[PDB]
Structure 1
């Protein structure tokens, strides 16, 4: 569980270097798939970092598991939050996969045996056992991401933060990664915050926070968010296909339902209106 209260950030001179956040307040409950979406240059990127020690904000509060975000205590906060970053080429350390997945376990002064089956049982989850030997440059990126995930499953946290991760992957990279963030929740019951512009990701979330120019501007169930039509793209998401189709029907004189409609639901609407 997190609580973020009256949060603001500016860096340097004199309003711009990083995207400013201003008076952001929101809360997340244990088990929640929260999506945070925004246009380019809003603080959604920055919101991700502030939840960890990265970024020293001088206004507002971040609390994670009772512990309140602060210096001399970031580490205890950081220890319940695993963070997959955007750009998988980086964020590695480790000549091989094992080494990496064990990097986290190392810092906790974990030693010897206990690491061996742990890192085994971590790669088993992200389906990467076969790749345990390989060097980072040797593999896809949608795979590099999974071994970052394995590296946080190893330390086995409460909260998994996804700062724009799918964002640099081919479609399979995307599809495969998401699926096992999903099946991860099925077992370990974890809290997933994800900063995004991926529809599928937001589509599989529980709530969506919408960040406009530095501020928390909207907050809803995602089937409700998607009713923003073409208006989606600027807001920071692409369009579901039914929403594209609706937009196209309107251009051609047909006015379709305003509420969201799944592909099944739209099918049935179409059929019934043409039967």
Structure 2
């Protein structure tokens, strides 16, 4: 139940199994390397036999080469499984995030989603594989050390297997106690840090009201309290390991005393006691690691639960089913009002605008509200809170999203150029339904083939980031070319600020009459030239419409039309 991850890692069980075998060999390498001490001392520097010290360097090098090569094999295989489960997790996560509605993508998570794909998904497999290493390698180290101690000295091994659970619980209970103490001290330290934050935050009022003398005198007390809290934190942290080592040394002294008093014991040779004591020092580390393996694993699976919440989150609802291809019917807004998801202030009041068929009715004015969100409403980026958007005699909630978004083409300057070729970028998604002849025809009709064909290889060069890096005016032309692959009877034109693209601005306008040759066009205009050729103008400020005139007819209540 706590995993919900085994199906994803199931196809790669071979890597886990071979990594476990490699780690078993890794632990056995150190176990045999410590077992070497008995021939090193008994057969070596005890009874004089130098022949055992001739091959002892060679067997040390052999076991160390085994240890290095099996450590690398374990790392490679466990990281291969981690890499492939990360690849599958990121693949599913990205496939689900692309389908998620943009309201989730808008300001709920914008830069941390890369961390979800990159950092948290890495952390899941990193912590899980670290836990598996720490429970296999170190567990087998404990088992091998106890086997060796049983084999060489079953008496001291019995004493050690009596106290090893005892010293394990002694480590675990004091670690938990001091970690809880450190958590309480951390909470207090965070409170004082937030007090310092509040001291820093009112910088403007310190300058006017009085000066820095009182603030410095109070920060002296706050920083002294921070210093005392830090000293107590590090004191509680540094009193932990000494106690653990002291209890481990109590166990060490008990084991050494088990060789002292019983005359039936102390039949060990020098090598046997050396091995059974080096086994204790080599067992201290696995005992310390096995106690903390569950915390690491639970951290990993907590990150994995965080990554699963996004994975199985609500996706973009596709309840509408009306399929539409080349709608000649026009869009109409009837008292539709939209509030931004995240806020409560309606940025768009009841809109009764009906944009006609084939016309170029624009929207004028920086409303700081749902002026731009009408574009989002046409393409169903943000679902309309109340009202109906009726295009071609049917509400947008009835249409299939895939068919509907094919009807609408969005032209802007903030255009995400996909990391592909120019031909694929201006024929994205439907890269096979348009052939390179259509690409050339649309580029020539876009008044944009001159610089595209100038661009290195032409239509087959790479347009992506860290590439040719076309400009914003050139991005307008590329988006217009993508729209001039047609199959988009609804045009929505952002127009940006129209920062003097000049012959490319004339390209935008010539291509705009080419688009509006048959397209129902809604322009969120910031250029008066588009207003001049606009057949109708509706001006919205602060989410409320003020006029529905037409340029010179609109000058009855001028306001800011001159500017």
CA contact (8 A) 1:53 1:71 kept: no
Q: Secondary structure at the match of 1:79?
A: helix
Normalising by structure 2, we get a TM-score of: 0.37
* Shift of residue 194, structure 1, vs aligned partner: 0.1
* Shift of residue 227, structure 1, vs aligned partner: 5.2
1: distance between equivalents of 2:355 and 2:399?
A: 24
2: distance between equivalents of 1:33 and 1:45?
A: 16
Choose the corresponding residue for 2:439, options 116, 119, 130.
119
Cross-structure match for 2:499: 169
**Range with greater deviation from structure 2 (173-182 or 203-212):** 173-182
* Shift of residue 155, structure 1, vs aligned partner: 3.9
5+ residue gaps, structure 2, are 1-329, 453-458
Choose the corresponding residue for 1:102, options 421, 427, 437.
427
After superposition, residues 22-171 of structure 1 pair within 5 angstroms as 22-70=349-397, 73-87=400-414, 90-106=415-431, 110-111=432-433, 114-130=434-450, 131=452, 132-134=459-461, 135=463, 137-163=468-494, 165-167=495-497, 169-171=499-501
Q: Secondary structure at the match of 2:447?
A: coil
2: distance between equivalents of 1:58 and 1:86?
A: 28
2: distance between equivalents of 1:181 and 1:72?
A: 27
After superposition, residues 167-206 of structure 1 pair within 5 angstroms as 167=497, 169-172=499-502, 173-185=504-516, 188-206=517-535
Distance 1:184 1:10, change over 3 A: closer
Distance 1:228 1:197, change over 3 A: farther
Cross-structure match for 1:219: 548
2: distance between equivalents of 1:170 and 1:212?
A: 25
Distance 1:13 1:123, change over 3 A: closer
1: distance between equivalents of 2:510 and 2:562?
A: 19
Q: Secondary structure at the match of 1:8?
A: strand
**Range with greater deviation from structure 2 (7-16 or 30-39):** 7-16
CA contact (8 A) 1:2 1:65 kept: yes
What is the total number of aligned residue pairs between the two structures? 222
Q: Secondary structure at the match of 1:220?
A: coil
1: distance between equivalents of 2:392 and 2:341?
A: 31
5+ residue gaps, structure 1, are 240-275
Distance 1:119 1:226, change over 3 A: farther
Q: Looking at secondary structure, tell me which structure has more helix per residue.
A: 2
CA contact (8 A) 1:10 1:21 kept: yes
Normalising by structure 1, we get a TM-score of: 0.72
* Shift of residue 84, structure 1, vs aligned partner: 1.0
Structure showing greater Rg = 2
Distance 1:37 1:181, change over 3 A: same
CA contact (8 A) 2:348 2:543 kept: yes
Note the aligned Cα RMSD (angstroms): 2.4
* Shift of residue 83, structure 1, vs aligned partner: 0.8
Cross-structure match for 1:208: 537
* Shift of residue 66, structure 1, vs aligned partner: 2.9
* Alpha-carbon displacement from aligned partner over 1:220-266 (angstroms, at most 9, x marks no partner): 1122224554x21xxxx553xxxxxxxxxxxxxxxxxxxxxxxxxxx
Specify which structure has the bigger relative contact order, considering alpha-carbon pairs within 8 angstroms and separated by 6 or more residues: 1
* Shift of residue 68, structure 1, vs aligned partner: 2.0
Q: Looking at secondary structure, tell me which structure has more strand per residue.
A: 1
Cross-structure match for 2:31: none
1: distance between equivalents of 2:373 and 2:528?
A: 20
* Alpha-carbon displacement from aligned partner over 1:25-46 (angstroms, at most 9, x marks no partner): 1112211011111334032111
Cross-structure match for 2:264: none
1: distance between equivalents of 2:527 and 2:373?
A: 18
CA contact (8 A) 2:448 2:507 kept: no
CA contact (8 A) 1:33 1:191 kept: yes
2: distance between equivalents of 1:176 and 1:127?
A: 5
CA contact (8 A) 1:142 1:177 kept: no
CA contact (8 A) 2:446 2:480 kept: yes
